[PDB]
Symmetry: D2
Subunit: 115 residues, 4 copies
């Protein structure tokens, strides 16, 4: 599938499990429209967000709910969430993986784009 | 100086200079209102964004214009911008430094609160 | 298998392919003894370094040959290599993944340890 | 001051204070010879390690004692230490800053050469 998210926890040295992810797509009126959502599995991966057909060209926001993750673990973090904003599929369909590493005061994201 | 932003370039091994940064505060109606802005200096740092008097508790967004930065170097980047969204909290320490490390397909951010 | 390495390239937004990895284990005389080696695949992953039986307790060094990687791409990087040094299997067998993100002047490593 | 080390703690959102750092230079016989050492300050930085006169071209190793740092906070970390190994090269810029970001199971390092 063309959009996947994988999250690691740098404190525990583990997949980040049960991380909620909401994806938005910029609409014609310039608002963020809800596009897809899900949560990471026991492997820290989130599969099945969308399909090739539905994942059209656009500007997408992948919101990773890092505060809700840290608060569900009873930890007080810094950030409200991690925001990944990117233009997708503007040269034809690609497959996008958003990889994230989380600590309470830091996060890091990288994109792996394949054709 | 309660808020400082520092931006580094992981490709060239340098400060990220002349990067535009826009800070917003979340208003009561959930909209982002402009709060402060600037360009990073030769050291990749942006000082003097706000004062202790103006910088009250609440949710702030720091938007870093990474796309223009990369395109000026002739590099096509992945992100439209980098975003850092956080709550400022008078409990605990007073000075927030937001540090960003940039690559064309990656951004990392950490907070140093002292 | 109990020791895996996965590497991403933050410049290209791709797996880091053909990255050489050498693993060492501290011997009784305190020298670094060669233990296993390999290179990342087209997926940026390196599987098959060792076995449960051979991967005994010890202090291991995973050397990721980042300079050779960047130089094979004709790019001049900063670091000679990335070094991951850790005690393994001291509470029983675990499975270790060393995840790395590379840029010419930076690198990042995280460990995912499962039981 | 051609070489500076700065260390940050991603768990607490603070400088990593009183972290021991040992710098070595590679000798002709491939052994690591002591070169300079220190503890990070209250700002998490370590200044005054060397001078331009002593810091000649060659391969250097910066070893950061992250394991003691974490254990003093009551945290069992993954790494025995962090290592940064690099060639110092008079071609191009003169001042090397080695920045490290620490978590118990992760370390990241970037170089800023100006
Ligand atoms: O004050 C100052 O001057 C100053 C200077 C520099 C600073 C830094 C230094 C280093 C970082 O490092 C950035 C974070 C590290 C990169 O993150 C990632 C590491 C590993 C992976 N890997 C994966 C994660 C999930 C799934 C799969 C992978 C994989 O296959 O590799 C992704 C991102 C950030 C800031 C801070 C302050």
């Amino acid at each position: 599938c063309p959009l996947m998210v994988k999250v690691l926890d740098a404190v525990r040295g583990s997949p980040a499990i049960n991380v909620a992810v909401h994806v938005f797509r910029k609409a014609a009126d310039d608002t963020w429209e809800p596009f897809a959502s899900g949560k990471t599995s026991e492997s820290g991966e989130l599969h099945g967000l969308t399909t090739e057909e539905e994942f059209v060209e656009g500007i997408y926001k992948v919101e990773i709910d890092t505060k809700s993750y840290w608060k569900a673990l009873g930890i007080s973090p810094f950030h409200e969430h991690a925001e990944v904003v990117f233009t997708a599929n503007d040269s034809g369909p690609r497959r996008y993986t958003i990889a994230a590493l989380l600590s309470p005061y830091s996060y890091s994201t990288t994109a792996v784009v394949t054709n």
